[PDB]
Amino acid sequence: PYRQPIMSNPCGTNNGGCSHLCLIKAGGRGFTCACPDDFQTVQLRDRTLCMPMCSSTQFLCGNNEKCIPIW
Amino acid sequence: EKGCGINECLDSSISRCDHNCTDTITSFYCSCLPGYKLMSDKRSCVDIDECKESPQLCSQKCENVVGSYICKCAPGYIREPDGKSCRQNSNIEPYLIFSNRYYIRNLTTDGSSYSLILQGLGNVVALDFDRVEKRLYWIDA
Amino acid sequence: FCFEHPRGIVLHPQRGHVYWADWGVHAYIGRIGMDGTNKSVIISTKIEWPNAITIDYTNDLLYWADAHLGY
Ligand SMILES: *[C@@H]1O[C@H](CO)[C@@H](O[C@@H]2O[C@H](CO)[C@@H](O[C@@H]3O[C@H](CO[C@H]4O[C@H](CO)[C@@H](O)[C@H](O)[C@@H]4O)[C@@H](O)[C@H](O[C@H]4O[C@H](CO)[C@@H](O)[C@H](O)[C@@H]4O)[C@@H]3O)[C@H](O)[C@H]2NC(C)=O)[C@H](O)[C@H]1NC(C)=O
Ligand SMILES: *[C@@H]1O[C@H](CO)[C@@H](O[C@@H]2O[C@H](CO)[C@@H](O[C@@H]3O[C@H](CO)[C@@H](O)[C@H](O)[C@@H]3O)[C@H](O)[C@H]2NC(C)=O)[C@H](O)[C@H]1NC(C)=O
Ligand SMILES: *[C@@H]1O[C@H](CO)[C@@H](O[C@@H]2O[C@H](CO)[C@@H](O[C@@H]3O[C@H](CO)[C@@H](O)[C@H](O)[C@@H]3O)[C@H](O)[C@H]2NC(C)=O)[C@H](O)[C@H]1NC(C)=O
Numbered sequence: 001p002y003r004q005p006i007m008s009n010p011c012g013t014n015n016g017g018c019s020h021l022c023l024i025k026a027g028g029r030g031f032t033c034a035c036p037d038d039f040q041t042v043q044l045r046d047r048t049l050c051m052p053m054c055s056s057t058q059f060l061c062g063n064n065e066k067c068i069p070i071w
Numbered sequence: 072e073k074g075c076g077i078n079e080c081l082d083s084s085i086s087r088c089d090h091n092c093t094d095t096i097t098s099f100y101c102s103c104l105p106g107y108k109l110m111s112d113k114r115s116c117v118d119i120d121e122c123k124e125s126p127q128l129c130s131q132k133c134e135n136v137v138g139s140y141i142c143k144c145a146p147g148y149i150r151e152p153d154g155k156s157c158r159q160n161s162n163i164e165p166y167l168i169f170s171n172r173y174y175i176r177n178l179t180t181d182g183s184s185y186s187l188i189l190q191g192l193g194n195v196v197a198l199d200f201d202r203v204e205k206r207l208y209w210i211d212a
Numbered sequence: 213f214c215f216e217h218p219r220g221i222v223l224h225p226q227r228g229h230v231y232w233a234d235w236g237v238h239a240y241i242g243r244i245g246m247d248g249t250n251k252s253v254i255i256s257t258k259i260e261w262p263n264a265i266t267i268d269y270t271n272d273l274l275y276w277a278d279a280h281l282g283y
């Protein structure tokens with residue numbers, strides 16, 4: 001356990017309010033919301049919109065949680 | 072031939088040997104105390120940042136002082152009476168986990184024990200662990 | 213210095229950086245933020261085959277091994 005030292009989670013108990021991904025900012029202090037591969041980051045005034053953007057050979061899941069190949 | 076030489080530091084601040092001085096038959100040479108180095112001007116001394124200039128002095132962490140240095144230990148470790156060697160304080164003993172192509176193996180730090188964590192894999196080329204969930208991850212290439 | 217043969221990775225979540233190595237023709241040890249910002253080159257000289265990389269966390273030193281130069 002010494003080789004993974006204890007630290008506070010910036011995205012603590014709320015996913016940092018991010019829709020999909022909360023990533024630690026460079027320098028460790030902050031956090032940045034991000035979107036998966038086949039999503040478009042339509043950044044709004046006070047939130048990041050992860051708008052789905054998947055090819056005609058892909059299928060979009062019901063909750064827009066991900067999109068998978070059509071086969 | 073200086074007629075014949077004598078110490079040139081004796082006169083007040085001639086050559087401005089910052090720390091200490093010594094002479095010879097036809098010249099002087101200043102010197103600096105341990106923990107101080109002379110810079111290019113050959114007259115003045117500066118502090119050594121032993122925590123950057125010589126990291127190996129302290130086993131675990133270093134704090135620079137003007138002159139000497141002090142070694143300290145990260146939380147969870149205690150410094151043994153030698154003044155420099157930190158020792159892990161947890162009563163959990165570390166063991167190595169490494170991959171052969173077909174196997175993830177368990178090996179003690181001193182090499183005393185050696186056992187299989189898992190077998191029959193394709194080609195495990197990388198692994199990592201998570202202490203929060205006590206879970207192990209690997210890439211089967 | 214470009215991704216040609218990535219190998220070896222270590223996180224440093226205290227300062228939010230990811231260090232990785234590449235043993236391509238122009239071998240290097242890179243650094244990036246955990247959220248994909250602040251790309252930089254940490255080591256680029258006297259390095260041919262950096263297969264191995266880690267951070268000690270207690271002293272905050274980066275360590276690596278070169279397979280060719282054998283150090
Ligand atoms: C190998 O080691 C692993 C890791 O230590 C063990 O996994 C843990 O097992 C314990 C049970 O012994 C789990 O404890 C239980 O956690 C529940 C909450 O977390 C779980 O459920 C949420 C649901 O969203 C998941 O997100 C999460 O990942 C967990 O799966 C509690 O609700 C449980 O409480 C119930 O039982 C306790 C007593 O045990 C009562 O006091 C409560 O009233 C209640 O009835 C329970 O505490 C623990 O969560 C597991 N860890 C993980 C990461 O899942 C394996 O069990 C172990 N395997 C063996 C065979 O040794
Ligand atoms: C983002 O990446 C850059 C580039 O790698 C980082 O910049 C570097 O930061 C270190 C630490 O501050 C600098 O070292 C220090 O430099 C000063 C002189 O400027 C010196 O007095 C100190 O003793 C120390 O050596 C380093 O020079 C600097 N490099 C550059 C080109 O700016 C930066 O820290 C990163 N920021 C984050 C938050 O990720
Ligand atoms: C090189 O030159 C330096 C600079 O003078 C010398 O440092 C001085 O050394 C003397 C003798 O050890 C120190 O004197 C002692 O001071 C204490 C008080 O701290 C006193 O109680 C003792 O009775 C004694 O007088 C002096 O403090 C020290 N100067 C400083 C500022 O550190 C050094 O000794 C010289 N080295 C050589 C090998 O020539």
Ligand SMILES: [Ca+2]
Nearest residue numbers: 136138139140
């Ligand atoms: Ca010092």
Ligand SMILES: [Ca+2]
Nearest residue numbers: 236237238239
């Ligand atoms: Ca090369």
Ligand SMILES: [Ca+2]
Nearest residue numbers: 279280281282
């Ligand atoms: Ca070799």
